[PDB]
Symmetry: C3
Subunit: 296 residues, 3 copies
């Protein structure tokens, strides 16, 4: 796209603020931003806010979201579909033109770990170029295992293809499959989908801890066989709904867009890989690390 | 196949009749029928009854099915495997020769949303050429959410490959992935697996309704990441068995042949896409539409 | 690998012995062994104990495993990752050099049907060349349906690719997808992942029996849509954990490394195929047979 040549729009922070006990404002951008997805490999991503996957959104069950998209792309329209919400797609997930904004309002009434993504045709093009992310909706009544959890992180799986190549997006294997982590609390890492960051800068934990991961596989095209090496998931909540409780899972199958809350205990000091057990994907980048120390 | 050149056997209606409180007769054909799977693209499908996927069968839990297959194909044997039934495959899912009939009897004792397909070697060839469908077995005791459901439809996902090409069937990506709808009540649409019909003629519903979909992914080869845009599944029954209850799912993973009953609320007027979130497949056809109006 | 040319190391029996009420010794080898994966096709597999998948391990919930790997490969290091165990991967799933041994100790505290595999980088290479298997951990309190089960077997699904070809392992479709059976009791078959053995020598059962299968899809790369033709699964325990109970499933979705305990009734004499309903994989080998007779 001629109008994207040389474009590298600096990341813009997510803006959120609570405007009522059950109402929250969110403002995101659509923007074109260079991201290093593998060493020496820059992808001029289509993004929310200059991150791919996009920034983490966290709301409470029952919150109505008043969402603004400011489209900084100079030529391509963009839009937003939150899987968390009840909305009219043809009214509320509509396009925002270049250099314009749009505001849409809709409720998040279901707890869980939801994908969000651009909804502009061809949606495959917009998702594969980077316009995906996660919104967490916290359950009013928590999870039954909340009191056991010592530490928590968010991990997202996505693919990368040949650059803006619709034939490859439709018909080709992914060139890379990657993990990223998005911060929940101050000091947590906040990273983009790449083959290396969570190897070189592992997530951190302490011996004996029960860890919760909020996870989503945003695809666009693949499923995930999510596994933490050296442990077993004590508890799994499919899509992060507390009712969808499984126990003692080795591996959690995630559809494209699928989420989960998974919890597991790290019993011994060391480094614990986090993989998809679809090992062709792990070989192509989808391995993160958890470093477990006596202190944390 | 020389004997299929120029063959286009007109669709023949499914025949069913109840013959006892727990016994039902079903008569289907195997026949060779041209189907427009994408605009301008005719596939000379191997079918049950001239539809691909085949006609919908609905029975009650505990019904014994007395099934007749009349093979109209001039050269290829065909057969029937119902996933709903307990049967001896080597006696009861056997081949029927060209221009012959065969009758087989077997019980449907499990509620749910089952695949059916031809069982003739190579089974991949017979399924990929179009010989797939759904049989619904209604639970004796219903589902716990029956009283909440306002409206219901059946949707089926399938792939199409290069025509009768066993190399492609085994080794290639699908050329198209598609939805079809099969009628449960008078006036419901009844369509074949194609890239366009359920876009151009959306399923219909009314604002505020709880919708039930009976769904199955018949493959042959792919899994599905089933999602209704702009809603969340309130309740999901895996394979349509009432016991396999999930709540608040964004996306339902379906194996090849996998079924589900999914229920969701449409809160606002508009058009709601129905997708697999494996967006390479959605791009290749697997998007249906649900049009939600103030009246229905 | 020059040092593997002409190498065919005869299979060595698994060694296990109980050393305390909650402690078990296991000794395995890593070795290079020719396996006929399809008629006329020899794969010089990287194996545990000369089998691919490797030998079956069965322990009790709460058993600590004192595991020794004796590496007979003349040049490549190997290692062991049991999905059953809590361990420090960077201390306990480490490499054993050629012609050396290593001993590692770790608890199996979770019931279920777990993958095991080599953990040596590139792990895809080691798994795809054959270093995969299953460990069953028997639940202390059994399964709720134990008293209904008449007969049980273990089945494992795996893929085979072009020989030691990392490009194909990462980017290619499987050349073969296969089932194998591993013995639980004397007289049970014990076979390797190949396209033919369980067709030519079916598993055996008697009319009317409830059959339990302990199943795992070891991949490396594909998911499985596991189905027994002519029946429905009465009960399914995901990953073999008794809590993860489903009923009346036609088809069980297994992620890569995913396990299950599945139970089903065979009502009539005959031969019952066992498939993945991803029929491209079934066409490429993934069909086993169950022969059901009046006697067994
Ligand atoms: Cu309030
Ligand atoms: Cu507002
Ligand atoms: Cu966009
Ligand atoms: Cu892939
Ligand atoms: Cu703790
Ligand atoms: Cu799956
Ligand atoms: Cu693993
Ligand atoms: Cu009766
Ligand atoms: Cu009759
Ligand atoms: Cu047929
Ligand atoms: Cu595909
Ligand atoms: Cu209603
Ligand atoms: Cu979506
Ligand atoms: Cu004891
Ligand atoms: Cu010892
Ligand atoms: Cu190895
Ligand atoms: Cu495949
Ligand atoms: Cu019995
Ligand atoms: Cu089938």
């Amino acid at each position: 796209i001629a109008a994207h040549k040389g474009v590298n729009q600096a990341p813009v922070p997510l803006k959120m603020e609570r405007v009522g006990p059950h109402d929250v404002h969110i403002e995101m951008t659509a923007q074109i931003t260079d991201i290093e997805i593998d060493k020496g490999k820059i992808y001029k991503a289509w993004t929310f806010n200059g991150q791919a996957p996009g920034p983490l959104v966290v709301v409470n069950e029952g919150d109505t979201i008043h969402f603004t998209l400011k489209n900084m792309d100079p030529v391509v329209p963009h839009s937003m579909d939150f899987h968390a919400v009840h909305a009219s797609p043809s009214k509320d997930f509509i396009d925002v033109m270049p250099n314009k904004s749009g505001t849409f309002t809709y409720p998040a009434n279901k707890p869980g770990v939801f994908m969000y993504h651009c909804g502009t045709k061809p949606v495959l093009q917009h998702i594969a170029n980077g316009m995906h992310g996660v919104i967490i909706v916290k359950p009013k009544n928590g999870y039954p295992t909340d009191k056991e959890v010592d530490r928590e992180y968010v991990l997202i799986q996505n693919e990368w293809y040949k650059y803006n190549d619709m034939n490859d997006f439709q018909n080709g294997v992914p060139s890379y499959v990657v993990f990223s982590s998005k911060a929940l609390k101050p000091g947590d890492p906040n990273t983009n989908g790449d083959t290396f960051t969570l190897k070189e800068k592992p997530l951190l934990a302490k011996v004996g801890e029960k860890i919760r991961l909020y996870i989503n596989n945003v695809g666009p095209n693949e499923v995930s066989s999510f596994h933490v090496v050296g442990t077993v998931f004590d508890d799994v909540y499919l899509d992060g709904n507390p009712n969808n409780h499984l126990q003692g899972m080795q591996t959690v199958m995630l559809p494209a867009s699928g989420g989960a809350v998974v919890e597991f205990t790290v019993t011994r000091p060391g480094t614990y890989p986090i993989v998809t057990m679809q090992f062709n994907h792990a070989q192509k980048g989808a391995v993160a690390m958890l470093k477990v120390t006596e202190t944390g």
